[PDB]
Amino acid sequence: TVALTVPAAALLPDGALGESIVRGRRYLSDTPAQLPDFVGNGLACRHCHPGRDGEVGTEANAAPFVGVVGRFPQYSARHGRLITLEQRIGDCFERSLNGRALALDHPALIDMLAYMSWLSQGVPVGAVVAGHGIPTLTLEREPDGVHGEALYQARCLACHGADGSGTLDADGRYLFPPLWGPRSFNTGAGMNRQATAAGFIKHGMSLSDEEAWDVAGFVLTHPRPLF
Ligand code: HEC
Numbered sequence: 287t288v289a290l291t292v293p294a295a296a297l298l299p300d301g302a303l304g305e306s307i308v309r310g311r312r313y314l315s316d317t318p319a320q321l322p323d324f325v326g327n328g329l330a331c332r333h334c335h336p337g338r339d340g341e342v343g344t345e346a347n348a349a350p351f352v353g354v355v356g357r358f359p360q361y362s363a364r365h366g367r368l369i370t371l372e373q374r375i376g377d378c379f380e381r382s383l384n385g386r387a388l389a390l391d392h393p394a395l396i397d398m399l400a401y402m403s404w405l406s407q408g409v410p411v412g413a414v415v416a417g418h419g420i421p422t423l424t425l426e427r428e429p430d431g432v433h434g435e436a437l438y439q440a441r442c443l444a445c446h447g448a449d450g451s452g453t454l455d456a457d458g459r460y461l462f463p464p465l466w467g468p469r470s471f472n473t474g475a476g477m478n479r480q481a482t483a484a485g486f487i488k489h490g491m492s493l494s495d496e497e498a499w500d501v502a503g504f505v506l507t508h509p510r511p512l513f
Pocket residue numbers: 314317329330331332333334335349350354357374375378379382383398418419420421471475476477482
């Protein structure tokens with residue numbers, strides 16, 4: 287693998303590419319407000335792809351976008367064939383954002399691509415960046431949702447709410463995003479899978495493995511939009 291590096295925003299180029307990169311960051315950080323026709327819930331991309339200093343997708347083990355562009359096109363079992371990064375992003379809109387995919391030449395999609403390409407600067411095409419994806423966490427026993435409920439009340443509820451509905455900020459964006467219910471990710475999302483949610487809870491955002499497994503189980507007992 288190669289190291290995860292974040293380029294300097296002060297070294298962003300003047301001109302069309304630089305402006306596109308800045309717009310892409312905003313689309314990724316503020317998606318429901320910037321792309322209402324395509325987003326069907328309360329989530330922005332940064333809610334599962336966080337980053338420090340205003341950037342999105344820069345955190346190891348929380349599915350960073352650093353180096354993503356050089357890994358596409360790639361096989362998708364879901365599609366049964368190779369897909370492009372544009373198509374992957376469309377799947378995220380449809381599932382994680384309970385919405386509608388952008389056209390593959392939509393200027394907002396191209397701005398998102400430009401941003402991801404900027405984050406990927408210097409990464410060799412084909413190389414895997416250390417900390418890519420969300421590592422799954424799988425235990426050799428059933429997730430105990432009863433224990434999970436107790437853990438949730440003690441460790442998560444203060445942010446994500448008794449009803450999993452999250453906490454809005456003053457500008458109507460989610461400070462702490464919804465974990466279930468109508469404004470959360472739909473059943474088609476990767477985060478709706480036990481081992482992915484457990485891995486995200488464990489590494490993506492301390493908890494023991496057993497605690498992460500059980501609380502993920504509790505979270506996933508709840509209703510959310512059907513895909
Ligand atoms: C509810 C959580 C969630 C939200 C919201 C979300 N994603 Fe994802 N995304 C994931 C998970 C989980 C993966 C799988 C990571 C892995 O491959 O290990 C993923 C993978 C990706 C990948 C592929 C990463 C790789 O290394 O191959 C891209 C690109 C991506 N997401 C873009 C987006 C964009 C753009 C948005 C906003 C439109 C978005 N995602 C919103 C959870 C989310």
